[PDB]
């Protein structure tokens, strides 16, 4: 199926309680590989999957050097958006940035992102077209007209469009036997009497990976939203991911309701029934 | 691989 | 500037089983901005040896962060995670549920 490489970095100013903290981190997938922080020990742009220690001394002394040289470029961005937006030296803020590529099953290039958020809302990103901008608010004009100048969606693009792409493949190829995994969810049903009246019904899906799942209810072969409740996809820890899905029904019709499981692992869709 | 790019002040 | 409070849910790794070690979870997400403090509790208590993932984020710039601790589930112990948040009056508890 179709892949992603993404990175995500988080700036915070703390004004009167030292410089702003800068965090990255890099996925494939749903799986993190590299991080670095910058008050942390090391001071260096470190692995978090077993296959990125494939990579030389020559790879972490340069992605060392071009997390460092970004946390100073949001340092002085910090400074020009309190500038732009008028507000005072005392108030924390927060930019944040994530780019990265998506391909297909082929794993060929479907779609590159570049954005950017100032607390906790849109500032600028780049358009799918990959050569303009778009602007959240007026201040952001202001970005946008320097960095057309500067005519960086060209340079953005060219790596989109290549090299992430290819580091991309390489790291599905250096990590095969867990990135290329498909671990298909192992389900069960509960059973609990909330009262005398109804009793809730729980499916549920473990143990999975990638984190995309459907898990949908029918009463009679009918879709049912009503009365059911959806908990968001979360981490198992171990690399894998859980979910479940629950309908409250009144007592002595449990046998109406099915549940049923979609996912990448599973060649047809499991049906589960009390 | 991140983008070998310094990007110019917002 | 926008602010978002967090979602928690908290569970543990594997199906319990008392007298079996596991992992006790805690995931809180889709909060702005990204200062918060979590707790995981034993019989009220705050657990020392807590350990979290790196800070990360949604589509949405909401932020997600992973609280985990190993523990043995037994017949004696009830355990929760306890969340501050900028967009809370006060802590926030949430009682774990071995089939949540």
Partial sequence: ????????????????????????????????????????????????????????????????????????????????????????????????????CDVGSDWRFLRGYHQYAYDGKDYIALKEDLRSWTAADMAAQTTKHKWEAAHVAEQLRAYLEGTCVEWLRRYLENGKETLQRTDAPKTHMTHHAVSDHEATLRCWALSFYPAEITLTWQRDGEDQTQDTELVETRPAGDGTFQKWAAVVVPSGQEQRYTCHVQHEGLPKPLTLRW | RQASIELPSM | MIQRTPKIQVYSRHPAENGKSNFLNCYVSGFHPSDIEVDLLKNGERIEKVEHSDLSFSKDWSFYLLYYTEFTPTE?????????????????????????
């Fill in chain 1, 1 to 100: 199926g179709s892949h992603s490489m993404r990175y995500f970095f988080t700036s915070v100013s703390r004004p009167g309680r030292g410089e702003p903290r800068f965090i990255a981190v890099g996925y494939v997938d749903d799986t993190q590989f590299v991080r670095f922080d910058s008050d942390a020990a090391s001071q260096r742009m470190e692995p978090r999957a077993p296959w990125i220690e494939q990579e030389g001394p020559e790879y972490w002394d340069g992605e060392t050097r071009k997390v460092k040289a970004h946390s100073q470029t949001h340092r002085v961005d910090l400074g020009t958006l309190r500038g732009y937006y008028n507000q005072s030296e005392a108030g924390s803020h927060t930019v944040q940035r994530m780019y990265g």
């Fill in chain 3, 76 to 100: 004696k112990d009830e355990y929760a995670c306890r969340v501050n948040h900028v967009t809370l009056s006060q802590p926030k508890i949430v009682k774990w549920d071995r089939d949540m």
